[PDB]
Amino acid sequence: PHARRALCLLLGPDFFTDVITIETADHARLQLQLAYNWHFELKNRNDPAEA
């Protein structure tokens, strides 16, 4: 919930080495490591509201 804390909001492309605990229709409980290839998007990188 709250582990890391930094002064900067990383906008560059990155990933999250997250693992989920999902269950399929056959009830098969399996955990699975995810990446979430993400990146922040700003069309106008000067507007105070959007920024």
Added chain:
Amino acid sequence: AKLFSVPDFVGDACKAIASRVRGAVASVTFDDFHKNSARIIRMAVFGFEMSLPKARDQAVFPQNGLVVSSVDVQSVEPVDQRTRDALQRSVQ
């Protein structure tokens, strides 16, 4: 100020969704509750018809304006050891 109407909004939201989810899963077999697990639990939270048919995409509480955008359920535990390695013979 209507935001602070309920002083325990976290508990209120959890209890209301839990109650309605439990009541709706109460009407379905275990086979159905596991085939359409997310489907029936998500229609349980905000049962209506605005999209069989999908209900909506908003679970609003008019008391304080608290809106549950979506409801996510992680894993069906069933705790007893007899649902356990007896459905495991079912596995075999």
